[PDB]
Amino acid sequence: KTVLVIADLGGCPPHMFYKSAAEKYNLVSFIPRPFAITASHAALIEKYSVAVIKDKDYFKSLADFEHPDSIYWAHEDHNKPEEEVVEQIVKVAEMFGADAITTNNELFIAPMAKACERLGLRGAGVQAAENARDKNKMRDAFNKAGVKSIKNKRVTTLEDFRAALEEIGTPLILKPTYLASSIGVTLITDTETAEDEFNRVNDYLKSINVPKAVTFEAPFIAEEFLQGEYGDWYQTEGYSDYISIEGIMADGEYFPIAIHDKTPQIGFTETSHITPSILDEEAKKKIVEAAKKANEGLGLQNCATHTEIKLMKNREPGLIESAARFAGWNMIPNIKKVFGLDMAQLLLDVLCFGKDADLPDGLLDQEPYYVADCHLYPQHFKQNGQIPETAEDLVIEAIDIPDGLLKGDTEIVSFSAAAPGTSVDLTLFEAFNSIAAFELKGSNSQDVAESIRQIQQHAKLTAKY
Amino acid sequence: KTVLVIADLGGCPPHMFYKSAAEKYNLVSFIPRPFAITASHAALIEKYSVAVIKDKDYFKSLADFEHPDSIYWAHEDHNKPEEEVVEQIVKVAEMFGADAITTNNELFIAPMAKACERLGLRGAGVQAAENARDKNKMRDAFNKAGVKSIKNKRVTTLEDFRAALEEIGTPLILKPTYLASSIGVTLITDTETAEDEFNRVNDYLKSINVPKAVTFEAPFIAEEFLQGEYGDWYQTEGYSDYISIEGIMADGEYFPIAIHDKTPQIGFTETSHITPSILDEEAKKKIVEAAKKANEGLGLQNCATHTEIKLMKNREPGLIESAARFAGWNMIPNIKKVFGLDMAQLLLDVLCFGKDADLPDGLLDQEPYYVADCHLYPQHFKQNGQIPETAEDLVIEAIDIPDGLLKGDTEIVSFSAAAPGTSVDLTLFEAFNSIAAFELKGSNSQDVAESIRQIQQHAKLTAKY
Ligand SMILES: Nc1ncnc2c1ncn2[C@@H]1O[C@H](COP(=O)(O)OP(=O)(O)O)[C@@H](O)[C@H]1O
Ligand SMILES: Nc1ncnc2c1ncn2[C@@H]1O[C@H](COP(=O)(O)OP(=O)(O)O)[C@@H](O)[C@H]1O
Ligand SMILES: [Mg+2]
Ligand SMILES: [Mg+2]
Ligand SMILES: [Mg+2]
Ligand SMILES: [Mg+2]
């Protein structure tokens, strides 16, 4: 079978996705945004695809033929309306007789779904995909679906916000409806400065770049802050009061695969994911039910899912959001390391063969150990005191992890720091701003989580200010 | 305009061809032999093409997704008949609305021509391309064309050869009709051992790999050895008694661009090319006339040409051979360095626009200096005595060029040796076996050629035997 991949940022990382897919399928890659593609990404696409097609228009000169090493968020304009994007996708599919279409990138989910339906291929579902991508429609579907419901309001203007603040009460979450990576997500707790904080993130939001193909009924959503209750859920310290759960939708039914525990965020910036969760079978069961309800509630037909859930009092799961694509970072690879299951090949099996694919019957179990995928950020070294506070940028010489920080049988499997000499802007959003990454392994989750904490605390940065 | 490139080995090197082409045209690359493609080659194709299509069939497992650093001659089978190859090429062209098709590789010239004619695009010409690729048909066309004619005979069997030897006389050239790089080309001078030497190269020839799409009326051609007379041509030492001339055919007319001088071969293995020739305007005129006659004699319509000519007594040009593609090594790039003319863009202009392209009116002149592209081989170090003779392979540690070897204002512009640790088989044909390369520049051709000699003589190899 021939699988068209719409190749862009995020989701199951290029280092796993292309090889896993090409092992069983003939991959054709469409690159709608050549400028979104790193050098390493471009070499993987070419290595594992039998054809590659790029959007011609985003080539003006030779300088446009260069690949950067790192892209944190795509900088350049993409001003084609959705229906045109659908048309490009359909055209590529028909050029290569694609039996399936898939993507790892948020921004192309909606149009891909329309293409699949036009082509009679399996997909997220047209309306379902819109639900999965506009947070107001998403939250509305969740409320209808009988999971924990919370007050939410569309916000466009200062007046909209002020209303919302009255109706919802603090604590209040205000976030854009159409981005990711916690971009813009703000916690309103003080009715005094609440309008001020609306104005600042309002302005910030029109300086970020998204394709014109990204539709939304309002710029912001305000909603009840879902309060954690860590102790109603976890028996030991080390984790946080949210998780993610990775699943597959197949012919409209939800198949859970694995729940990931997390380390505490910095602000709303994520720090680490641990495959798989230490939570007890009853907690996992409650999480699974909420994610089933939410995703089936969205209407999703065939796709991967990444669903984020707040661990609230009385063991109530609160739906934070759900995406119709794979978890980012190394969560999908780490599922394969732990359990041997290749969720990328499993999605493609489902797209090409439906419930004929070999879907597990429940969350995977019998993990031989735990694996943590962890990032460090400048803000860790501001909190460390390694970076002075009065510092709007720096230039990075080295990042070192002192010995003696690991608990129990935990190990450092890998570690990679921003290359010596790397320039760092210290004004920009942490999430774009990771400067080091590491993988731990160990038989004891609590020890793994403690080792992550120690490493965050004691890592040594050498830079010049 | 959209240009389909059939991407394989040889001709204008990937480091120039893809960028030059993509500067003016949208390139679609067809890779009929993924295993012919080095890592550096694959990255260039992907960097500069708006689409890439590979032949699916030459992917069995993940191991087939690897790119080697170096390919001297494509190892794997390609057993599709010509008409099928034509069909693939036509299919790709029609998929992308190609306005032109081109290739740098000998082995795809014939089929490309048939595709172009089927598509109503400019090309070599169906019959012309067959002439340019079967050396018996080629030599026949040359003889008809009124250049120096020589006796030639088809050879398939020991009996065919023995006849030929009687009819032609020594000195005699026996060579395969369908390969390149001097593979199999043998000099018969002694009627005693002549049959023996036929049997050995007969056997050797069935152990080399070519696609089944390569048609020929006989395996070998025997022909008169064209005798040099260096002194009838050159006024100084340093060169050899053959040259090449690089041209463009446009609507059936020959356009010379540049003549390259050469350093003496090792056996029949080429050593260096110097852009442009030092030969006087009358010698150049004679060379141009022979190359016009030969190429126009073949019937070539639209293509690049690389024509090799023996410098024979009384200033008679002897046609050695002519290919309907670009010279290999760095001859095309070095034309651009010397004269500023980009012959790759000039070919594509001609394919898309005919004699509307900006063809020069005569050989390029006013060179600001000379540029030599030079290779060293193991056999240089056997002749140096650096490698013992009783040595069937070695492993290369380093290659060093002593100071004080350069004449006049000559310079070493670049130098690259086989990477320290490289394994070298010393049984295999020199031409596949280059272990070092360098570029010289200088205002004095005779000094440049002398500096090449010194470097060949005195280079130092460190290896283990
Ligand atoms: N309603 C909410 N209640 C509690 N926390 C939230 C809420 N919305 C967002 N967050 C926090 O902010 C993070 C980012 O918000 P999310 O809805 O996941 O948007 P994004 O698509 O930017 O990641 C979440 O992981 C969660 O920690
Ligand atoms: N008829 C000939 N007379 C003299 N030299 C020849 C003849 N044929 C081949 N050679 C020599 O052998 C080399 C390789 O032969 P050529 O016909 O160019 O085949 P290939 O396509 O392998 O390069 C030529 O460059 C030339 O030096
Ligand atoms: Mg999100
Ligand atoms: Mg999120
Ligand atoms: Mg040849
Ligand atoms: Mg030749």
From Swiss-Prot, chains A, B:
Effect of Y72F: Almost no effect on catalytic efficiency
Name assigned to this protein: Alanine--anticapsin ligase
Cofactor: Mg(2+)
Substitution effect: E308D: Loss of ligase activity
Keyword list, A-Z: Antibiotic biosynthesis, ATP-binding, Ligase, Magnesium, Metal-binding, Nucleotide-binding
Residues marked Plays a key role in restricting the N-terminal substrate specificity to small amino acids such as L-Ala (site): W329
Temperature dependence: Optimum temperature is 37 degrees Celsius.
Subunit structure: Monomer or homodimer.
